[PDB]
Design a protein around this ligand. Structure first.
Ligand SMILES: [Zn+2]
Lengths: 99, 149, 50, 199, 76, 50, 209, 54
C-alpha cells in the first residue's frame, strides 16, 4: 500500500526504503536496488510522458473570483486599521508599539 | 541634574530589561522571567525567583556561577536549540564532544587563537593556524621541543 | 598563499584532472565515467607479478 | 513596483548567501583546525594527541552517529520487531502469552553473549518486551483468548502473534546491531564532529 | 581480549592494502586465483576466504599490546 | 523547437538532450578564433631576429 | 527591611547546613529541615538577630572521619571584612583549637584581606563565601550534576582499571563554585554523574588542579 | 534654566553673596538677587507598566 515519494525514496530523513535495505541486508543490496530504480524510472517516465504547459498554471474563474473577494476584504480591513490608527485609538498588542 | 535621574534605586545594575513571558500550556498558564542582562548570580539571589531552574545564555557567566559542568550543559543546550531553530538536527554526541573538548581543562576555552593555544601544544600546529612568526619565535626562545604526535 | 597554508596544508598534486560533469543514470552509484583522453594521460604504476 | 520589490528581496538573499559562504568557510576552518586532534582509542576513551582524555566514553554510551537508526536512538524496537515478524513467520508454532514471553526473554537475555552488552540497552529491551507483553495481554483479555491454545477461532491468534523463534531472532538482531553500531577505534571523531557542525 | 571482537573498517582497509602491495610485489597466493589480475581483488578474495597471514597488533593508549588474527576476528 | 518533457533520464538536474540529426544539420555550430602574435625586434646592437 | 533580611539569613543557614551535610560534618535532621517558623522563634527581628556572634556555629564536627576535628563558621556584620576582623577570627580559632573555618561575607572582601586570607597559614584553612552565592544551593540546581569526592582507594582503583596517571584526568579549577562548595583541595578527584536523556547515567571523573 | 546677562550675554551661575543667593556672570560685575521662588521642572518620562508577553 501507499505511493512512493520524497518521504520514502528521497534523502529527507529516516524511514527510507533504501535506508532500511542498507541497515538490514547490507550495502550491495541497497546499491543494486538504487541502480535498478535509476534504470527503470527513466524508461517508464519517457514511455508515459510528463510535460508542463501554460494551461497547467493558468487560473480558473472560481479562483479569480475568490482572489478578488479576498483582496477586496483585505484592502477594506487594512483601510479600517489605518483609519483606526490615524484618527482614534487602535488596540495595541502586548510588547510592541502602535506602529 | 545631569547624572541624578540615572541613579539606580531598586534592581540589579547589570539587568537592563526584564519581561514576563507566559506559557499557555493547556494544563495551566505559567509565568517566567526573561532578563536581557549579564548577571545570573543576582537573578538567582533575588527573592521569589526559583534559582534551581534558572538558565542563562552567557557561557562565561554560567561557568563562573554554577561551575564547569553547568557551563558544559548550557553550551550543549544552547547549541542544540540554535540548531533546531533552523529545522536541521544534529546528533547530540557531536555537541557533547565539542563541549567536553572546550571544558576538559576546567575552564571554558574558545576555538579562537587565544583559546586553542592553551589547549593544544604542537608548535607546528599553532604556527600553521595563526600568528606564524610570533609563535615560531616564542618557541625558538623557549626551546620547546615539538613531537610528531 | 603561505608555506603553512599555501604549501603544506594545501598543495597541488599530479595525476589529477578537472572536467565538467554530465548526467548518466545508466551507471551504478559507485561507478564514474572517465573519458578516453583523460584516461590515456592519467597512468597507474602496476608491478609485474605472476 | 512589485517586480522592483521582488528584485530587492532577491538581491538581499543573494548577498546574504554570499556573506554566509565566507563566514561558514572561516568557521569550518577554525573548527577543523581545533578538533583535528581527537580520535577514538581502543579502550573506548577519546583522547587528544598529547594523551589527555577528553571523554571516558564517546557520547556517554559509545554509539556511532552514522549508524543511528532511530531519532538519537540505536534501534527502533517496533520497526525491528515488525521486520522480524514479517521475515520469519512460523505457522507451525503456537503463540506466546505474557508470562511465556517474559520467561523466554529472561532466559535468553541471561546468556553469555548478552553480558558484554551495556545495561541501558538491556533495560530498554526489557521495557519494550514488557510493553508488548502488556499489549498482548490486553488484546487477549478483550477477545477472550485463552493461553492454553484450545480456542475455537484460530484467527484471534493472528491479532498479536509471537513465537519463541521470532523472539530469539529479534533479540539476536538487536544485539548484533547494537554491537556493530559502536564507535570503531581509530575514527577521526573530532574531524567528523567539526564537519557535521560546519556543514 | 577486552577490545571489540569485530574487525573495524580501518583494519579491513589497512590489511587489504598491505596484502595488495605484497601481492603486487610478487607474494605467494593462498586462494588459487582464477584470472584475477587485480591485486586488490586478490586481497579481497583472501580476506573473504580468511587466509591472509597478517596479525593485527592493537596498541592501547597506555602502552600494552594485543595480537588478533584475521581469521580470529569477525568480518562483515 | 524545444519540447518540455523528461526523456531517457539524461535531463535530471538542469541538463538537456540534443538531437544528433539537428546537430549534424548545422544546429549550434560554433567557431573559435585565436590569435598567435610574434615580434621580431631589433636590439641595441646592429642585429635582428630572423 | 526586617522581612527579607531574616529570610535571607534563614536560607543562608539552611544552605550552610546542606553544605556541611554534603561535606560529611555532623548535622541533625532538625537543623537540616529548619523552617522559617523555627528561625523566627530563634530570632524574628533584624536588630535582635546577631550576625557576628548569634549566627556563628561551632558544633560542626566530622563524625565520619574524627569527632575531634572541628569546623567553624563566621558571619561578619560589616559589609567589607578588614584585616583586623581577619586577625580577630584567626586568634579566636587559635584559642579554640580549630583549623577549618568559613567566612560568609555580606558584600565582598578587600584585595588586601583576600591576600591575607590566602597566605594566612597552611594549617589554618579559611574559605570565603559570598551571601549572594550562598542564597542558592549549587547542588540543588538542575544543570549541576551529582558530584562525589572519591577517596584514595577509589582513585587508585580507577587508575589501575584505566591505566592512567593523575595528570591525564580532566582538570577542574580549585576556584570553581562546586569545588569551593565541596572544599576539595589539589590532588583530589571528584566523580560526576550526568543523567542522560534516557534513564541512564554517564560517570566521569575530574582532578582538582 | 539657562539665564544670560543682559549686559554681555554670557551664562549666569548661582552663587551666594553677602545677603542672599544671586545670579552672577564670570565676565562682568552684573548680578541679580533672588526675591521669590524660582523653579525649573523637566517632567521626566515615567516607566510604563510593561505588560505580559505572549
Ligand atoms: Zn554677564
Amino acid at each position: 500500500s501507499g505511493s512512493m515519494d520524497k518521504g520514502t525514496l528521497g534523502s529527507g530523513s529516516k524511514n527510507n526504503i533504501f535506508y532500511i535495505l542498507l541497515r538490514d541486508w547490507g550495502q550491495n543490496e541497497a546499491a543494486d536496488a538504487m541502480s535498478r530504480l535509476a534504470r527503470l524510472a527513466p524508461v517508464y517516465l519517457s514511455n508515459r510522458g510528463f510535460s508542463i504547459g501554460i494551461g497547467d498554471v493558468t487560473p480558473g474563474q472560481g479562483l479569480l473570483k475568490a482572489k478578488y473577494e479576498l483582496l477586496n476584504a483585505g484592502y477594506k480591513k487594512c483601510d479600517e486599521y489605518i483609519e483606526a490608527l490615524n484618527t482614534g485609538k487602535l488596540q495595541q498588542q502586548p510588547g510592541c508599539t502602535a506602529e | 541634574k545631569e547624572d541624578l535621574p540615572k541613579v539606580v534605586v531598586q534592581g540589579i545594575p547589570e539587568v537592563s530589561r526584564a519581561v514576563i513571558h507566559i506559557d499557555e500550556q493547556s494544563g495551566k498558564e505559567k509565568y517566567k522571567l526573561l532578563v536581557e542582562g549579564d548577571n545570573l548570580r543576582a537573578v538567582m539571589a533575588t527573592h521569589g525567583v526559583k534559582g534551581t531552574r534558572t538558565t542563562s545564555n552567557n557561557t562565561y557567566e554560567v561557568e563562573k556561577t554554577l561551575g564547569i559542568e553547568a557551563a558544559r550543559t548550557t553550551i550543549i543546550n544552547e547549541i542544540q536549540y540554535t540548531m533546531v531553530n533552523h529545522g536541521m538536527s544534529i546528533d547530540r554526541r557531536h555537541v557533547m564532544l565539542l563541549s567536553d573538548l572546550m571544558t576538559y581543562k576546567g575552564e571554558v576555552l574558545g576555538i579562537t587563537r587565544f583559546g586553542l593555544a592553551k589547549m593544544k601544544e604542537s608548535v607546528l600546529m599553532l604556527a600553521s593556524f595563526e600568528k606564524t612568526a610570533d609563535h615560531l619565535f616564542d618557541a625558538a626562545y623557549f626551546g620547546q621541543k615539538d613531537s610528531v604526535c | 598563499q603561505g608555506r603553512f597554508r599555501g604549501n603544506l596544508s594545501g598543495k597541488r598534486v599530479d595525476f589529477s584532472g578537472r572536467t565538467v560533469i554530465s548526467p548518466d543514470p545508466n551507471l551504478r552509484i559507485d561507478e564514474v565515467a572517465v573519458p578516453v583522453h583523460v584516461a590515456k594521460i592519467l597512468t597507474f604504476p602496476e608491478k609485474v607479478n605472476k | 513596483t512589485e517586480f522592483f520589490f521582488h528584485t530587492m528581496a532577491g538581491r538581499e538573499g543573494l548577498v546574504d548567501t554570499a556573506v554566509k559562504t565566507a563566514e561558514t568557510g572561516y568557521m569550518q576552518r577554525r573548527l577543523v583546525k581545533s578538533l583535528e586532534d581527537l580520535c577514538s582509542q581502543y579502550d573506548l576513551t577519546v583522547r587528544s594527541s598529547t594523551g589527555d582524555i577528553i571523554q571516558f566514553i564517546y557520547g556517554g554510551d559509545g554509539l556511532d552517529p552514522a549508524a543511528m537508526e532511530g531519532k538519537d536512538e540505536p534501534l527502533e524496537f517496533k520497526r525491528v520487531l515488525d521486520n522480524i515478524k514479517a521475515v520469519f513467520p512460523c505457522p507451525s508454532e503456537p503463540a506466546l502469552s505474557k508470562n511465556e514471553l517474559i520467561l523466554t526473554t529472561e532466559s535468553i537475555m541471561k546468556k553469555s553473549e548478552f553480558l558484554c552488552c551495556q545495561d541501558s540497552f538491556l533495560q530498554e529491551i526489557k521495557k519494550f518486551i514488557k510493553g508488548v507483553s502488556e499489549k498482548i495481554k490486553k488484546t487477549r483479555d478483550k477477545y477472550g483468548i485463552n493461553d492454553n491454545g484450545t480456542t475455537e477461532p484460530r484467527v484471534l491468534y493472528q491479532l498479536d502473534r509471537i513465537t519463541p523463534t521470532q523472539v530469539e531472532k529479534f533479540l539476536e538482531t538487536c544485539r548484533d546491531k547494537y554491537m556493530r553500531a559502536q564507535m570503531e577505534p581509530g575514527s577521526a571523531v573530532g574531524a567528523l564532529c567539526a564537519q557535521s557542525i560546519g556543514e | 581480549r577486552i577490545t571489540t571482537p569485530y574487525m573495524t573498517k580501518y583494519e579491513r582497509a589497512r590489511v587489504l592494502g598491505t596484502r595488495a602491495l605484497q601481492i603486487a610485489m610478487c607474494a605467494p597466493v593462498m586462494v588459487e586465483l582464477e584470472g584475477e589480475t587485480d591485486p586488490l581483488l586478490i586481497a579481497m578474495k583472501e580476506l573473504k576466504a580468511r587466509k591472509i597471514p597478517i596479525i593485527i597488533r592493537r596498541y592501547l593508549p597506555d602502552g600494552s599490546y594485543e595480537d588478533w588474527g584475521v581469521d580470529e576476528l569477525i568480518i562483515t | 523547437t524545444v519540447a518540455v518533457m523528461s526523456y531517457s533520464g539524461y535531463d535530471i538536474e538542469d541538463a538537456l538532450v540534443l538531437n544528433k540529426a539537428s546537430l549534424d544539420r548545422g544546429f549550434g555550430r560554433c567557431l573559435v578564433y585565436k590569435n598567435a602574435k610574434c615580434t621580431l625586434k631589433r636590439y641595441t646592437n646592429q642585429t635582428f631576429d630572423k | 527591611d526586617d522581612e527579607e533580611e531574616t529570610y535571607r539569613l534563614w536560607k543562608i543557614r539552611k544552605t550552610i547546613m546542606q553544605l556541611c551535610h554534603d561535606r560529611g560534618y555532623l548535622v541533625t535532621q532538625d537543623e537540616l529541615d529548619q523552617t522559617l517558623e523555627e528561625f523566627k522563634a530563634q530570632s524574628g527581628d533584624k536588630p535582635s538577630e546577631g550576625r557576628p556572634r548569634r549566627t556563628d556555629l561551632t558544633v560542626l564536627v566530622a563524625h565520619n572521619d574524627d569527632p575531634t576535628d572541628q569546623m567553624f563558621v563566621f558571619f561578619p556584620e560589616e559589609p567589607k571584612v578588614g584585616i583586623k576582623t581577619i586577625k580577630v577570627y584567626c586568634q579566636r580559632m587559635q584559642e579554640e583549637n580549630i583549623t577549618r573555618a568559613l567566612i560568609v561575607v555580606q558584600q565582598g572582601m578587600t584585595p588586601s584581606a583576600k591576600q591575607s586570607l590566602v597566605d594566612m597559614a597552611p594549617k589554618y584553612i579559611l574559605e570565603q563565601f559570598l551571601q549572594q552565592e550562598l542564597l542558592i544551593n549549587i547542588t540543588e540546581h538542575e544543570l549541576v550534576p551529582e558530584h562525589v569526592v572519591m577517596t584514595k582507594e577509589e582513585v587508585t582503583e580507577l587508575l589501575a582499571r584505566y591505566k592512567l596517571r593523575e595528570n591525564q584526568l580532566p582538570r577542574i579549577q580549585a576556584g570553581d563554585p562546586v569545588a569551593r562548595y565541596f572544599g576539595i583541595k589539589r590532588g583530589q578527584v571528584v566523580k560526576i554523574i550526568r543523567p542522560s536523556e534516557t534513564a541512564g547515567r554517564y560517570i566521569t571523573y575530574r582532578l582538582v588542579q | 534654566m539657562l539665564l544670560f546677562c543682559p549686559g554681555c550675554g554670557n551664562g549666569l551661575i548661582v552663587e551666594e553673596g553677602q545677603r542672599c543667593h544671586r545670579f552672577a556672570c564670570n565676565t562682568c560685575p552684573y548680578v541679580h538677587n533672588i526675591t521669590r521662588k524660582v523653579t525649573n521642572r523637566k517632567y521626566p518620562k515615567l516607566k510604563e507598566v510593561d505588560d505580559v508577553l505572549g
